[PDB]
Each structure stands twice: as structure tokens, then as C-alpha cells.
Design a binder for these strands. Structure first.
Length: 246
DNA sequence: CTTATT
DNA sequence: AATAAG
């Protein structure tokens, strides 16, 4: 099965990803920025117990680490509890980058009628596959208490304004060669949502095998549960792709 | 929780 | 002078 043939490619069997070819990211600040330390609003025990096992898993995975930082932003006290960091004051102090992710409408314009066999993959915990340079880690620090200090991220965090664009650009670099090796396949990338299109069932099977092999080797992980493999009809970016339509 | 947006 | 999102 698709599961068995590519253990490394799937999130369910390959472990947490890590994009091994990508240098740890340095996050430039605006020219006038200085650190902001925002106090953590008190969190109820209910919310703290809800959040706690997620924090512990991330610590175990090395995605969070202890730190002491002059930066601090709050975790939401009401966040099915999973921690959500309010990074708006950090985002304001980080230098802007050009938004290079295409909007879905334009992206799908590059899908020709000749290619009507589809594979759709979504990468699991995509931002977390990208390492942050140690110099940039303190930027994203927050407080954590167990009724005691700060933690921060060692990977590109949720809620950071440039994460989608930086991920999209990193994956484009990592999939550049795949595109060159498979000139007859169509590959659409929208941050962590991928569409592979081919002219035949067999070509789509072979391409999908090569894409999974490649993604796994690079350190990314796709959702086996959500995967739509070699169908003439798929759901991609809120559209139903069918009979060359939409 | 905070904060931007008829 | 509810709303959606970090």
C-alpha cells in the first residue's frame, strides 16, 4: 500500500519532520526595533491543564526549549485546548518581506486540461519542519508555569506573520530538482497544500511515488489520512477539481 | 485576553 | 460610538 511503500513520507509513520537541506532561518528586525516583553495574563488551571500535554510533547520533540529572553508574548488563556501565542507585537517589529505566495485563483490557472489525474497532499506541521537560527529563537519566547520561566521555539512558529511565505519559499527550493526531473508533471504549491497533476493514471502513480520519496528524504511529512491519491476528482484549496473544472 | 475592523 | 484573528 501507499502507506507501506513510503514509511518516511507520511506523518503517521515517519516521525516529526525536519527540513534537513534548509539552513536555520534568521529573522531580520526592522531598523528601529527593540525587544517587547508583554506580561502573561493569568491562566486558569483548566486552561493550563489543557495546554500542558502539548507543551510537554513539544519539549520532548525539541521544538520548544527553555530560555531567558528580553522578548515575551502571551499565550491565550481561553484557547479542545491547544496553545495559541499572540505574536502581534513581535510581528510589528519584524522587517516585512514581499508576499510571494500566489492566491489560489491564480495558482489554479496553471492547471491545464491535458492533466486530469490528481494527487493532493498536505504537509503535517509544516512550519515546524523549518529550523530557526539560534539568534532568532529568543524573539518568540513566552512564559510557562507549573503550579518556572520562559520557553521558545526552535522552529518556524504559528502566528508569525512571515511563516507561510518563508515555508512556501523553502519548499520551492527543496522541490526545484523534482520539477526538473519530472518536466511532464504539474506541481502546484500553496504553502503546505500540494497538487500533483499528470496526463495518465500510471504517470500520476509514478509521479506520486517519486514525490513522496522526495518529500520524505527532504524531511517533510504528508498526512496519510487526508491524502487523495491518483483520483480524477479531488478537493484542493476549497475547490472541487473535476472534469477539468473549477 | 487583547486588538484591528448601523 | 459584534466579529475575527494572534
Amino acid at each position: 500500500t501507499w502507506l507501506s511503500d513510503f514509511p518516511q513520507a507520511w506523518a503517521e509513520t515517519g516521525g516529526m519532520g525536519l527540513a534537513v537541506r534548509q539552513a536555520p532561518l534568521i529573522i531580520p528586525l526592522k531598523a528601529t526595533s527593540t525587544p517587547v516583553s508583554i506580561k502573561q495574563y493569568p491562566m486558569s488551571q483548566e486552561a493550563r491543564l489543557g495546554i500542558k500535554p502539548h507543551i510537554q510533547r513539544l519539549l520532548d520533540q525539541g521544538i520548544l526549549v527553555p530560555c531567558q529572553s528580553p522578548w515575551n508574548t502571551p499565550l491565550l488563556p481561553v484557547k479542545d485546548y491547544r496553545p495559541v501565542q499572540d505574536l502581534r507585537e513581535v510581528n510589528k517589529r519584524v522587517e516585512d518581506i514581499h508576499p510571494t505566495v500566489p492566491n489560489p485563483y491564480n495558482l489554479l490557472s496553471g492547471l491545464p486540461p491535458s492533466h486530469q489525474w490528481y494527487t493532493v497532499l498536505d504537509l503535517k506541521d509544516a512550519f515546524f519542519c523549518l529550523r530557526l537560527h539560534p539568534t532568532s529563537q529568543p524573539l518568540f519566547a513566552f512564559e510557562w508555569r507549573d503550579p518556572s520561566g520562559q520557553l521558545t521555539w526552535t522552529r518556524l512558529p504559528q502566528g508569525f506573520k512571515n511563516s507561510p511565505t518563508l515555508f512556501d519559499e523553502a519548499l520551492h527550493r527543496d522541490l526545484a530538482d523534482f520539477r526538473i526531473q519530472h518536466p511532464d508533471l504539474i506541481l502546484l504549491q500553496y504553502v503546505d497544500d500540494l497538487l500533483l497533476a499528470a496526463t495518465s493514471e500510471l504517470d500520476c502513480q509514478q509521479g506520486t511515488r517519486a514525490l513522496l520519496q522526495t518529500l520524505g528524504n527532504l524531511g517533510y511529512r504528508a498526512s496519510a489520512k487526508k491524502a487523495q491519491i491518483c483520483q480524477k476528482q479531488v478537493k484542493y484549496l476549497g475547490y472541487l477539481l473535476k472534469e477539468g473544472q473549477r
